[PDB]
Design a protein around this nucleic acid. Structure first.
Ligand SMILES: Nc1ccn([C@H]2C[C@H](O)[C@@H](COP(=O)(O)OP(=O)(O)OP(=O)(O)O)O2)c(=O)n1
Ligand SMILES: [Ca+2]
Ligand SMILES: [Ca+2]
Length: 511
DNA sequence: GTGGATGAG
DNA sequence: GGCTCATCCAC
């Protein structure tokens, strides 16, 4: 007591873009668009957020609006099943490419669920286009980057934000913000601000106890506080409070510009944010204070298999290995080794040197069992902070069509599909340049397919650009040759009807 | 050198 | 259940 637990070094780190995630006062955020595809189709057709709309692909549902979820409809239910749950369901099929044409289109009012035999989208000669979701995604991304100086795109509809710089500056220099009436952050946070500019402190000194007045700062969103704890006790709570405020603005910016609802999760770690953002949906914001991490991790909805990269076999193994139960496993891993990663480390090292398994059907890499320990240790305590890295440069881009029926039955048929794959790849190449803001062009194409008997043929080679680097024509030119050379390689062999056909581009010159 | 595994969208 | 993405490694 009589002094804040944290130090200046830790608070200042929020200003550094490369060392802000390690800080204890770190304020990360994860934002996941609710029923994305379902939402975008809703917005496109000018429907309301409460409409039972659903994104359809062929016969399956790939996106379920929360409005339609009240009818018990779930992802991947066949349209037929859904309609038996909500006869007033509003199914919308994704845009599609028609064999031969170089552009995708929306066939609203058409679908397998439609009686009229004319209005149909035969999967036989159609390719799903995900471009619409791409664009919208790209938009939300530009708004995110304009509000935060560090955004990690985890997926097509997910992003992580490092509110470090914002919270810090807001904490030390914002003079507009109001907490209540006749009270501003500047006057409520005088000591700390006046001690900061003074700079008569040592980076390793401890921060002054938060001012009794700052406790009137309110959190924006749901603060996961089951054990009914004090919302504001130290700076991490202040930083988190401001963070939640700032965060609300950004999200609203999205609902206002694009009209997409979202769920968000704040905490001092990417992993906890990931869980928090999923805790409540739709259009919510779960806030996990550091002093509520365990209460949260032990609420009863998570498991070791509920964390990141552990929801698969690697997860089901760690259970049968560490001899973990099937309930309150996170609280377990924590209590069986409440000293340090070393405890659990030597436990694995000892559990791997016996007649329990072989180094073949296992997912653990013994020479790295030291990390696995430190990881699980931290994860079980909600302190495994990963840096908000950036998505690595793209290596390749494929565009295929798992052929069904006698669609691709000849060479021209192959070509017709090639036209589609190029139109799409070309489209995706532009989207790439927009992200890297640098010219991107494939230096090599590749054609592969699967014969009637499922055999694999494939020709790879370099694509040459001469004139205006038309990465939307010469690409197809090479594709045709290749698909034609393969047509010759299998003349009196099992070949047509092809069962699969795909075009891929690699070796990119990010000049 | 890749078809599968693995994990999540 | 359909289909897109990004490692990583025995055979
Ligand atoms: N097996 C899956 C999982 C997801 N998606 C698509 C549907 C969504 O538009 C986008 C989003 O991924 P989510 O898993 O986050 O799906 P939702 O947006 O539908 O629901 P929620 O926001 O509750 O996660 O990816 C898909 O085609 N196939
Ligand atoms: Ca998700
Ligand atoms: Ca989502």
């Amino acid at each position: 007591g009589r002094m804040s637990k944290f130090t200046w070094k830790e608070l200042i780190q929020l200003g550094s873009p490369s060392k802000a995630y390690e800080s204890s006062l770190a304020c990360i955020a994860h934002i996941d668009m609710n029923a994305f595809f379902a939402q975008v189709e809703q917005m496109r057709c000018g429907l309301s957020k409460e409409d039972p709309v659903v994104c359809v692909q062929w016969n399956s549902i790939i996106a379920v609006s929360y409005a339609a979820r009240k009818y018990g409809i779930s992802r991947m239910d066949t349209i037929q099943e859904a309609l038996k749950k909500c006869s007033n369901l509003i199914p919308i099929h994704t845009a599609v490419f028609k064999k031969g044409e170089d552009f995708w289109q929306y066939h609203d009012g058409c679908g397998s669920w439609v009686q009229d035999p004319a209005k149909q989208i035969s999967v036989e000669d159609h390719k799903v286009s995900l471009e619409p979701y791409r664009r919208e995604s790209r938009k939300a991304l530009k708004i995110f980057k304009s509000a935060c100086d560090l955004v990690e795109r985890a997926s097509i509809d997910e992003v992580f934000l490092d509110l470090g710089r914002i919270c810090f500056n807001m904490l030390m220099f914002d003079n507009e913000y109001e907490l209540t009436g006749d009270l501003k952050l500047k006057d409520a946070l005088s000591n700390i601000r006046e001690a900061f500019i003074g700079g008569n402190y040592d980076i390793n000194s401890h921060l002054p106890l938060i001012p009794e007045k700052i406790k009137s700062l309110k959190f924006e969103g749901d603060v996961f506080n089951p054990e009914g704890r004090d919302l504001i006790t130290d700076w991490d709570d202040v930083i988190l409070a401001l963070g939640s405020q700032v965060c609300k603005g950004i999200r609203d910016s999205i609902k206002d510009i694009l009209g997409y609802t979202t769920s968000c999760g704040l905490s001092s770690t990417k992993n906890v944010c990931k869980l928090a953002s999923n805790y409540k949906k739709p259009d919510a914001q779960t806030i996990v204070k550091n002093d509520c991490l365990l209460d949260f991790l032990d609420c009863g909805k998570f498991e070791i298999t509920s964390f990141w990269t552990l929801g698969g076999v690697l997860g089901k193994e760690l259970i049968d290995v560490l001899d973990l139960p099937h309930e309150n496993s996170i609280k377990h891993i924590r209590e069986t080794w409440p000293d340090n990663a070393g405890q659990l480390k030597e436990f694995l090292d000892a559990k791997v040197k016996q007649s329990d398994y072989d180094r073949s059907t296992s997912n653990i890499d013994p020479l790295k069992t030291a990390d696995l320990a430190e990881k699980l240790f931290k994860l079980s305590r909600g302190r495994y902070g990963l840096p908000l890295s950036s998505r690595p440069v793209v290596k390749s881009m494929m565009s295929n069509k798992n052929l069904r029926g006698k669609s691709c039955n000849s060479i021209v048929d192959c070509i017709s599909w090639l036209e589609v794959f190029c139109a799409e790849l070309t489209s995706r190449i532009q989207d790439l340049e927009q992200e890297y803001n640098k010219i991107v062009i494939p230096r090599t194409v590749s054609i592969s397919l699967k014969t009637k008997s499922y055999e694999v043929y494939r020709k790879s080679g370099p694509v040459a650009y001469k004139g205006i680097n038309f990465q939307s024509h010469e690409l197809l030119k090479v594709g045709i040759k290749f698909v034609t050379d393969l047509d010759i390689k299998g003349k009196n062999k099992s070949y047509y009807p092809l069962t699969k056909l795909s075009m891929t581009i690699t070796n990119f010159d990010i000049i």
